[PDB]
């Protein structure tokens, strides 16, 4: 196919996304959930991983790793230790609230995804790490898990298969760095949420020292629909190596911010003008677009017109898809203040274990505050770029890269505004 977008309503995986049906077991089973799951559990982990590999499903957390290879990293014999599948539901990334809607409205899809993923790698039990502030969503998930346990779907002889399974929920304590998989693994174990170094990878040494596979909410909940509908159906959408459907959160200076399921290769402008109502003041009132939240650099209107919102095309556009969160800023926005607020958010949310992030994020916060006040020199700006090059690639986890990227994008795409601001401050105050 050449023109993408405009996903059909019958091909949308996440039905009852807006909460227009019942979220309990009766509403879940009347929409197509928990159908022939016993055959899925009986056909074998190799068959399940083959169906995942045929679909071409990639990591929806924000890194875009192939889910088939990562899930096949556990296809090894047991060594006297159990195996665990952990579903990441921290949701600390600004601009992204799709997994909150998935948990609050369709929890049984997530539970069936946990069971299918646990059988797919021989996991003894599943843990779900939810945010501390998501008390009502955690309570809804607990109600759904209790109704699944009481109906014999999971527990002893789960879904009439002979392979037992347990699903747990562990509530967080309000930390963004706990969204990282190794910091999440450490936070489950009662330690502080500080990430580990890889190697050892979590597939070898994870939670409690046992083998552990950490996966996003939507890349887990899609898997029952992958195993039921088929590999070719899920691989038909989008370009090659970018297959599937994605939940896009459009927010910012838009008339109707929302969360919408769409095909992968939908253009940005078409998606905004169709599923969100367009930018206030017209499309020509657009100034900047953040494509996937705080972990990717912004792009201007000159490139946003003809860009494709998948991994490869946005990587070619010197940015990243990330969590697919379209933040929109129009021409009436002080984007220096927006990047300063983003860097201050990173300053307030940083685990501080490894020193380059721990010092350079506060350094960037001070430099951005001086830039907002305009008390800066032009020769400082390139130095700031060099500071980013001392953070990107020298950190334990990827929060340092996610801190260096928005400043690099802001400099690269809006240097004349920064020079104008500092020249204006120098002309006025001196």
């Amino acid at each position: 196919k050449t023109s993408f977008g405009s996903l059909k309503d019958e091909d949308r995986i996440f039905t009852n996304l807006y909460g227009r049906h019942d979220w309990r077991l009766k509403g879940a089973q009347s929409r197509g959930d928990w159908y022939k799951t016993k055959e899925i559990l009986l056909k074998g982990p190799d068959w399940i991983l083959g169906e995942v590999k045929t679909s071409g499903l990639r990591g929806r957390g924000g890194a875009g790793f192939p889910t088939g290879l990562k899930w096949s990293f556990m296809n090894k014999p047991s060594d006297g230790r159990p195996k665990y599948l952990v579903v990441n539901a921290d949701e600390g990334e600004p601009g992204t609230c799709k997994d909150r809607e998935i948990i609050r409205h369709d929890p049984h899809k997530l539970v069936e995804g946990c069971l299918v993923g646990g059988r797919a790698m021989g996991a003894r039990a599943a843990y779900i790490y939810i945010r501390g502030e998501f008390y009502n969503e955690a309570s809804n998930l607990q109600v759904a898990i209790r109704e699944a346990y009481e109906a014999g779907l999971i527990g002893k002889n789960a879904c009439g298969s002979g392979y037992d399974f347990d699903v747990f929920v562990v509530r967080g304590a309000g930390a963004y760095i706990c969204g990282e998989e190794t910091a999440l693994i450490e936070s489950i174990e009662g330690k502080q949420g500080k990430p580990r170094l890889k190697p050892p990878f979590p597939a070898d040494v994870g939670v409690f020292g046992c083998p552990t596979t950490v996966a996003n909410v939507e890349t887990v909940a899609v898997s029952p629909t992958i195993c039921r509908r088929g590999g070719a159906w899920f691989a038909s959408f989008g370009r090659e190596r970018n297959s599937g459907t994605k939940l896009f959160n459009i927010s910012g200076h838009v008339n109707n911010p929302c969360t919408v399921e769409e095909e992968m290769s939908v253009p940005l402008k078409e998606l905004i003008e169709k599923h969100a109502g367009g930018v206030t003041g017209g499309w020509d009132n657009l100034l900047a677009v953040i494509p996937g939240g705080s972990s990717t650099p912004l792009i201007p209107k000159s490139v946003c017109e003809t860009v494709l919102m998948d991994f490869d095309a946005l990587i070619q556009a010197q940015t990243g898809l990330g969590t697919a969160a379209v933040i929109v800023m129009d021409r009436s926005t002080d984007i220096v203040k927006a990047i300063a607020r983003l860097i201050e958010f990173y300053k307030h949310e940083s685990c501080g274990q490894c020193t380059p992030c721990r010092e350079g994020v506060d350094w960037m916060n001070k430099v951005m505050a001086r830039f907002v006040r305009g008390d800066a020199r032009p020769a400082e700006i390139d130095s700031l770029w060099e500071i980013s090059k001392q953070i990107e690639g020298h950190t334990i986890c990827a929060l340092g890269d996610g801190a260096a990227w928005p400043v690099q994008g802001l400099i690269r795409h809006f240097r004349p505004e920064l020079e104008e601001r500092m020249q204006r401050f120098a002309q006025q105050h001196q």
């Binding site: 909460g19 227009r20 049906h21 019942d22 979220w23 509403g27 159990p82 609050r104 409205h105 003894r124 008390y135 009502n136 955690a138 309570s139 809804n140 607990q142 109600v143 898990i145 209790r146 346990y149 009481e150 527990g155 002893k156 037992d164 347990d166 929920v169 509530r171 409690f208």
Partner: protein
Amino acid sequence: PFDNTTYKNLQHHDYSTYTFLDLNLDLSKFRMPQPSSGRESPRH
């Protein structure tokens, strides 16, 4: 019938400050015995 005009998720207005923990205590009876690490604690 087919209804898509009412917000059906109205249960969350009836949750106290002890809903999650009491639900976990009620759900603990369905769970299997946990695996053992061979010791009481790493500091034991």
